[PDB]
């Protein structure tokens, strides 16, 4: 059925939803802690998402770190939130709810499974095509 067979599920899928929340904020100490968990990393610490009143990183910034740095998967937020269209178009106040990533950087959008895999328009299928199985497997192990 020209579709991916892999699928991140349950606890992992739920925390990912939790992780995409707007209220997600990180500390520098924990960023180093998170960085070591990485199966692979550039060795170059990223710039804080916030500088004042105090330096901070966002979970979307950090999720995008996990993401390979020259590939994108667009729009299929596939979540109930917003408005069976028409409404989210009201007025392109177009973020958060709907999913969008650019240059391996997540702009907005709570994640779903249709994004996460075993379906058309999934990030998993295009990574397989561009990054290939070997890069995609290391990304997948890393994210989990």
């Amino acid at each position: 059925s020209n579709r991916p067979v892999m699928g991140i599920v349950q606890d992992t899928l739920t925390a990912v939803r939790k992780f995409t929340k707007r209220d997600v904020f990180l500390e520098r100490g924990e960023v180093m802690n998170l960085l070591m968990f990485l199966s692979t990393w550039d060795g170059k610490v990223p710039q804080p998402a916030i500088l004042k009143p105090r330096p901070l990183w966002t979970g979307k910034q950090i999720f995008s770190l996990i993401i390979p740095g020259h590939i994108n998967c667009i729009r299929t937020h596939s979540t109930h939130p917003d408005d069976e269209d028409s409404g989210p178009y009201k007025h392109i106040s177009p973020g958060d709810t709907k999913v969008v990533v650019e240059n391996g950087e997540l702009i907005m959008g709570i994640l779903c499974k249709k994004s996460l895999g075993t379906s058309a328009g999934s990030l998993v299928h295009i990574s397989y095509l561009e990054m290939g199985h070997d890069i995609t497997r290391l990304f997948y192990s890393n994210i989990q």
Partner: protein
Amino acid sequence: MAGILFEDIFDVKDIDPEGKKFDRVSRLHCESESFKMDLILDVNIQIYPVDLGDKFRLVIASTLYEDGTLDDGEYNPTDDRPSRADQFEYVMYGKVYRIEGDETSTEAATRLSAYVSYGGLLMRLQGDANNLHGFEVDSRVYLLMKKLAF
């Protein structure tokens, strides 16, 4: 030398994004004192407790060390260069993700709109020519605000 990208003093139209809002983040609606340009922005209310109708000072700079390049990172906490206005109450690092306009009308492009993202934080700026020198780019802009509850 400190080629600032943008600077203006803004007024709060709204602090209540369509009522429903969110917990640690909230989206403000503002308008420039020229009352020709307006702004909507997601903010951390917990670290910057906004009031409605407040008079804010807003500055935007794609760089910190005088005008030279720095669009990198290990953001180096140990910098000692007075190059940063830092003196503003609130600072953010981000990208421009979307630009609106309308050039199909013939030259038009008449009421240009810019949309910006600071770590996912959405922003919308509207204006005929205030954004005539800017455009959508990867993360580079620094947004600085003060004059809270003036």
